[PDB]
Swiss-Prot record, chain A:
Disruption phenotype: When this gene is missing the Gabija type I system does not confer resistance to SpBeta in B.subtilis. When this gene is missing the Gabija type I system does not confer resistance to T7 in E.coli. Component of antiviral defense system Gabija type I, composed of GajA and GajB. Expression of Gabija type I in B.subtilis (strain BEST7003) confers resistance to phages phi105, phi29, rho14, SpBeta and SBSphiC. Expression of Gabija type I in E.coli B (strain ATCC 11303) confers resistance to phage T7. May be a helicase or contribute to GajA activation. Residues 1-221 form the UvrD-like helicase ATP-binding domain. Contains a UvrD-like helicase domain. ATP binds at A17, G18, A19, G20, S21, G22, K23, T24. This is Gabija protein GajB. Belongs to the helicase family. Homodimer. Interacts with GajA; 2 GajB dimers dock at opposite sides of the GajA complex to form a 4:4 GajA-GajB assembly (GajAB). GajAB interacts with Bacillus phage Phi3T Gad1 protein; this interaction forms a 4:4:8 GajAB-Gad1 complex and leads to GajAB inhibition. The record marks V144, Q147 as: Interaction with GajA.
Curated annotation (Swiss-Prot), chain B:
Homotetramer. Forms the core of the anti-phage defense complex. Interacts with GajB; 2 GajB dimers dock at opposite sides of the GajA complex to form a 4:4 GajA-GajB assembly (GajAB). GajAB interacts with Bacillus phage Phi3T Gad1 protein; this interaction forms a 4:4:8 GajAB-Gad1 complex and leads to GajAB inhibition. InterPro entries: AAA_GajA/Old/RecF-like (IPR041685), Bact_Antivir_Def_Nuclease (IPR051396), P-loop_NTPase (IPR027417), TOPRIM_OLD (IPR034139). Changing H221A: Retains endonuclease activity, ATP only partially inhibits endonuclease activity. The lineage of its organism: Bacteria, Bacillati, Bacillota, Bacilli, Bacillales. This is Endonuclease GajA. The gene is gajA.
From Swiss-Prot, chain C:
Keywords: Antiviral defense, Endonuclease, Host-virus interaction, Hydrolase, Magnesium, Metal-binding, Nuclease. Changing D254A: Loss of endonuclease activity. GO terms for molecular function: endonuclease activity; metal ion binding. The keyword Magnesium applies. Optimum pH is 9.0. The chain holds residues 258 to 575 of 578 of the full protein. Residues 113-253 are annotated as: Toprim domain. Optimum temperature is 37-42 degrees Celsius. This is Endonuclease GajA. Rapid, sequence-specific cleavage at physiological concentrations of Mg(2+) (4-5 mM) or Mn(2+) (15 uM). In presence of >20 uM Mn(2+) has rapid non-specific cleavage activity.
Amino acid sequence: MSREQIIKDGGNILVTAGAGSGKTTILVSKIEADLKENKTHYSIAAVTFTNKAAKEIEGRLGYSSRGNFIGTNDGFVESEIIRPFIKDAFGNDYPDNFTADNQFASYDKGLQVLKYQNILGTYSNPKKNFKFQLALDILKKSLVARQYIFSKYFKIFIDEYQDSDKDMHNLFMYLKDQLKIKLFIVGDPKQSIYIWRGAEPENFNGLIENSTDFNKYHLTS
Amino acid sequence: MKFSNITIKNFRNFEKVNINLDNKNVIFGMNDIGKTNFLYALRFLLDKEIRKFGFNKSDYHKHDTSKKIEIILTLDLSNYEKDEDTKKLISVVKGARTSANADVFYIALESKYDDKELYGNIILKWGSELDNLIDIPGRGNINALDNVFKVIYINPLVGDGRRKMLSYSIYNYLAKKKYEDKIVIYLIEEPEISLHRSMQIALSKQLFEQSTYKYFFLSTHSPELLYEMDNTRLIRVHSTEKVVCSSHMYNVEEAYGSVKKKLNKALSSALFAERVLLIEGPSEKILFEKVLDEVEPEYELNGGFLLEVGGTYFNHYVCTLNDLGITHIIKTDNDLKSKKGKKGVYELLGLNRCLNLLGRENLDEITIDIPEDIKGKKKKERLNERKKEIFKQYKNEVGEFLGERIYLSEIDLENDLYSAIGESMKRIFENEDPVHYLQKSKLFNMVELVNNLSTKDCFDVFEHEKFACLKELVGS
Amino acid sequence: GDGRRKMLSYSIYNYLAKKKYEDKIVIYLIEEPEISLHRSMQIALSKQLFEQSTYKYFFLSTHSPELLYEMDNTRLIRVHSTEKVVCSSHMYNVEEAYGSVKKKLNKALSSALFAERVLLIEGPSEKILFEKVLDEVEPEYELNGGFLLEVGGTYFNHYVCTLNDLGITHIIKTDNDLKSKKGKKGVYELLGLNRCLNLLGRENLDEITIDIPEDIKGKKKKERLNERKKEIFKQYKNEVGEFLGERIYLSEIDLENDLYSAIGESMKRIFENEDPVHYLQKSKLFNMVELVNNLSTKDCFDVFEHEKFACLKELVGS
């Protein structure tokens, strides 16, 4: 079946797979194949929505001294973009300390909380994201941030793309286009029950029905 | 992308030393203690198996453990776009860089002695700004800096030259496949211990014309290893008790392309000297060797050298020697070269070669009638009179030359030698004009002359004013 | 540095083995003394070994020609580079005639002892030309055991005796020279033929006389002497054939004319508006640099493959 046409493909890929298809198995197989094939210094990043899937993938992959990021997409920005390069973009007064109750309805008040209060902000409206817009803002203001992101990873694995806001799409597409980093997207179109958290199913469907540089496969197993 | 500089303070016999670097570096000199301590400092900074231990009381300068050891290395990150080693460095460093300083990086070492525990702890830092460095993170026995650099140390100790070459080959084709994800630096210490000459030349070609040795530091006592040198830093350690170092960025110009094998062979043996006298041909070699053997037999034991320059300009040799701190003396004579094509116009070759070493360059040409009737000795004396006039005209320039240790003859060396030993030359060259006869066969007649010179003639030549370069060579 | 400690060790050896062993026969075995030694210290040790009475008996193994700068009155033993041990030995001495140039012979011959084939040349012009040509054609000739030796203004006997006795292949390239005798005018010595004959056991030859009227001078005299050289070369044809069997190559006139016979068109191109040979012979050193700076690979392969340059094929082992 098509499960052998994926491991042999290197680049941008989609996998429109429904429930019970075995997304974890194919994701782990592709990750292991990519790591075994490549002999350079580059790494991979696997971004999920829950800590359970992150821990499952971490346990399945094993142990290595190569630095790969496995975790949630909220931890990705905090660990890679915001915490290291916040002061290089805005200034030395902006703090890199935070432990995240204090949600507001504006971006400027989010910056004010992060600075004066010294705690990561939030938004009251679930249709808009503070983390993934601040991350993209930092990426466009810091040259060393973009340099590190380009020098570090050669592929990023994304799963459950249907439950993604517009800010997540913006950041991922910025990475794909402006920084020339490959993407591996897996998602079920009919699993948008998380719409109560601001999920936008239109992004995955638009990618499926309009993308020209994406290779598309479907799994019925 | 590029190594730039290194600073060492209060470490062993180093007190405060600043050395400029490149990717390929060669260190040479007569100290032989600072040369090894240089590589030890490099190993301490970049080698985890050496840094794994601490610093003793003997590692501090003057054994005064109340001072701090600092070793700091500088890199250039200008070619991030075209280099993949810059990415290897940048992927482990994240946050220690700033955008205003995106092209320079620092790696530092610091040690302070503990008198109660009798231990010297080593702590590493990097940063883009030298006034704001932070500790390199790590867990357990491992460091974040150990993920980047792979230091390969080569030493013959701790026919058989073929076994050495096999060792070099296995090194070259092992460090490639296994370390495609690291930055590899080679430290080669005296590779000529029990090595045949041709094998030394082969290793020189490997070092300077193969891509397997992008970064290395080499210590050598042999000029055969330097037959192929190009695009390298030469670091010279001065022969004193206080460590003093001079460095030069060596290159060969595209103009000096067809004679590159002669420049390298000539200059390799002069790098291991203290004073060098630059001469033209083998006649001067014969004469000065005879005179020095008669007067100063041990001139070459004390660091003297005679260098044959040939048919080129002095810039290439003088730049290197001056930058390395070696004293250079030049003896030349006033030459007129007939221009290619038009007849009757000559070039002030000697004056031009002497001027180009003073920054001032080139001079206008001259024209001499030389009617077709005259020919032979008459033409020679006509040209000699013109040379005398030219020499008298530029007296101030000649006085400027003498201040730079440049000695230009009015006509030639034969006439200067006559002005000193004319009676002896008349005796030996019976029934001829000594200068004219000596100028017929330069090589055989010079041997005839030296075979009939006594100690009195040698001391007459040595003590003359026209031969003041020989006193400079032997240090008076 | 540590070489000074080595010199101190040598001094203590010398002034300890004397007082303590005045009643014994002392033999020194010195093995590779140049391991971590500066060049000047190697020269000093050479002087100590060959000009001091403390070392009456010794055996020395070396890889360095700087230790041999002072050699005299010694056996040189050469071990051939094979699997079966083969050795050649020579009793080296320097004649009283070769007394004022002894420092040049030793320096020249020290580096040729560590070679397999040696080509003996005259001056730096041939050095420049052959270095350019070999770098173009055979870049690794010196890695395989080739050497170029500048002989200068002496005879070939001193070098050839040593090299032949040690088993090293020697090639000689020379040209027909006439040297005006000291004193009487109009008589010249067949210097090139005499130097080539002395290597065949036969020695010296009768002189010749050429009119050379006082009217002619310059290029006319040069061509008169060149015609005389051509006649001399044609006269002793059998001797030249004998020379060729000993790996001795004598030019009819000079190297400039042999180079013309090979690359005349290129020389005319480069030396525009002059006679190539006459212009090239004005300034020997600068004009050779001018020539080599404008030669291509085609010219180098033309020179290499010519019959007048068959010594270069001998040097590289064909």
